[PDB]
Ligand SMILES: *[C@@H]1O[C@H](CO[C@@H]2O[C@@H](C)[C@@H](O)[C@@H](O)[C@@H]2O)[C@@H](O[C@@H]2O[C@H](CO)[C@@H](O)[C@H](O)[C@H]2NC(C)=O)[C@H](O)[C@H]1NC(C)=O
């Protein structure tokens with residue numbers, strides 16, 4: 001089966017899914033390979049081809065450093081690239097239902113990974129289940145990460161910043177020009193993403209050049225106002241310079257620095273990325289979105305606060321234990337291979353790791369607000385508190401504050417709190433409902449009865465998949481047939497949200513109220 005696109009013909013492949021068929025187009029190029037003279041620049045439009053492009057395998061993943069903290073462990077290694085790294089990585093995938101749809105809603109996935117890592121080819125991003133089950137079209141794209149995707153010399157078009165975001169945007173563009181040929185409705189496009197993918201989605205809501213490239217948006221465990229999601233022009237330029245020094249590329253002509261960085265091998269840029277921040281951490285967003293005056297015209301907190309964003313519906317949510325995963329990537333006394341009971345002094349040391357440039361008073365105030373124990377003697381008190389600190393600060397309270405503020409400008413918003421721990425989760429139990437482990441439910445992996453998910457999990461994924469698809473098609477994430485709890489609109493006053501679990505889906509109000517008044521109202525002053 002061959003589809004004629006604006007740039008040439010592309011050949012796909014047939015997939016058997018649940019006694020049905022899905023047509024997959026894996027690895028369609030959507031931009032000139034950003035190579036040589038093109039490294040660090042915005043993505044350039046693709047010159048047509050005459051032949052038939054074979055889009056039958058995932059393309060190259062973009063260059064990136066790899067998580068090597070747990071070699072051989074599926075809990076970490078399932079997130080690492082599963083295709084060759086290359087700078088030639090600006091490709092996208094398309095899953096379409098078979099038989100070919102007539103006017104199908106399109107779902108576009110944007111992966112996370114702190115803007116330093118990630119790839120669309122991961123097993124948990126397989127769109128074939130959504131296409132089969134809900135008859136939507138699923139699109140995902142690779143986008144540049146790290147310095148190669150977000151190196152910033154603001155104003156300088158040789159390295160303007162936000163290239164990876166313009167990569168995402170050129171892909172949304174491609175869907176607008178082409179998806180009708182695949183049976184998709186370019187007027188019914190829902191972006192969805194997780195973590196840095198969700199922050200990306202929220203920034204497309206703010207960027208005028210994306211306003212007309214999509215309809216609705218879903219934000220899973222991420223938003224641009226998260227403290228890790230936007231690099232300051234101060235940090236960015238200090239980081240660009242440190243990368244220059246580290247590679248022998250320091251110059252006075254800012255443009256000649258870039259020319260110098262353009263001759264370095266991709267691996268020399270990767271090696272030196274970690275050290276551009278003196279507070280070196282494997283959790284460091286070394287190179288991320290900036291206020292570039294192109295993609296972002298202003299500081300996004302101002303745009304959010306003053307209503308300068310796309311007026312549409314959003315679906316936003318978080319997981320119960322967003323913070324735990326990060327505790328084994330540097331916090332003292334923590335291990336995935338034991339229950340990580342930590343002392344007060346280990347907790348205090350963990351705050352220093354996660355809040356590096358923060359005053360002593362700032363850290364004491366975190367301790368004060370998170371160590372008023374319901375029981376003094378519980379040995380896991382400090383271990384649980386540090387997880388909640390990292391998750392509330394980095395994910396939950398920014399997503400809640402994003403939703404309140406977005407909804408105050410009159411748009412329907414829906415907030416969820418995912419609290420199911422996957423029965424297959426390879427990480428230990430004290431880690432709970434981890435960051436990233438709703439994704440397989442969203443993509444319908446538990447719908448495949450053959451892979452050891454329980455029956456309760458099949459049903460939960462089935463409902464979630466239905467709610468996501470109804471949100472994308474109809475702006476309203478209900479499951480209307482199986483006497484399901486109705487999902488209320490999130491309002492700035494009521495703050496109602498829906499819990500997602502295998503047992504009882506219920507309606508609650510004002511998630512982490514006390515914790516988020518601390519993080520959102522007080523802590524930004526310290
Ligand atoms: C901004 O950058 C300077 C320079 O960073 C140093 O050089 C880089 C190539 C890289 O290898 C970093 O690890 C280096 O730290 C920072 O200044 C350094 O600060 C640390 C501690 O703050 C100090 O021990 C070093 O001696 C300093 N080096 C120099 C040359 O001043 C600076 O902290 C960075 N951040 C800010 C906010 O200014």
Ligand SMILES: *[C@@H]1O[C@H](CO[C@@H]2O[C@@H](C)[C@@H](O)[C@@H](O)[C@@H]2O)[C@@H](O[C@@H]2O[C@H](CO)[C@@H](O)[C@H](O)[C@H]2NC(C)=O)[C@H](O)[C@H]1NC(C)=O
Nearest residue numbers: 328330331332333334335336337338339340341342343346
């Ligand atoms: C849980 O484990 C951590 C990590 O220690 C490593 O992993 C273990 C599973 C085991 O293989 C150890 O030999 C490894 O070193 C423990 O943290 C260490 O604790 C000891 C004594 O308290 C200390 O000397 C080390 O510096 C610690 N390492 C750190 C902080 O990175 C922790 O004590 C274990 N906790 C429990 C309750 O078992």
Ligand SMILES: CC(C)(C)OC(=O)N1CCC[C@H](C[NH2+]CCOc2cccc3c2ccn3Cc2ccccc2)C1
Nearest residue numbers: 067079112113114117195228282283284285325394436
């Ligand atoms: C891949 C996925 C997004 C689904 O889940 C995860 O990332 N993990 C869950 C399990 C551990 C593995 C580490 N992830 C690999 C590299 O990802 C990053 C690199 C750098 C910064 C990052 C990230 C991710 C977030 N931030 C921002 C940040 C948030 C909070 C505290 C400090 C930083 C995967």
Ligand SMILES: *[C@@H]1O[C@H](CO[C@@H]2O[C@@H](C)[C@@H](O)[C@@H](O)[C@@H]2O)[C@@H](O)[C@H](O)[C@H]1NC(C)=O
Nearest residue numbers: 010011012013014051052053054055056057
């Ligand atoms: C593109 O593919 C054409 C047909 O390939 C068919 O499907 C793939 C998956 C293989 O199983 C192959 O044996 C089949 O014939 C090729 O004939 C054609 O040469 C390919 N073109 C390029 C440029 O690779």
Ligand SMILES: *[C@@H]1O[C@H](CO)[C@@H](O)[C@H](O)[C@H]1NC(C)=O
Nearest residue numbers: 102103104184185186187188
């Ligand atoms: C698809 O739906 C849009 C409205 O959402 C409509 O304008 C367009 O003509 C439709 N295209 C079809 C049915 O081919």
Ligand SMILES: *[C@@H]1O[C@H](CO)[C@@H](O)[C@H](O)[C@H]1NC(C)=O
Nearest residue numbers: 252253254255256257258259
């Ligand atoms: C050097 O800097 C000048 C401005 O001072 C700029 O116009 C020129 O393009 C730069 N040269 C190169 C080779 O980039």
Ligand SMILES: *[C@@H]1O[C@H](CO)[C@@H](O)[C@H](O)[C@H]1NC(C)=O
Nearest residue numbers: 459462463466479480481482
């Ligand atoms: C509704 O329940 C039926 C069983 O009666 C099940 O087969 C179906 O998948 C459910 N639909 C949704 C959207 O959960």
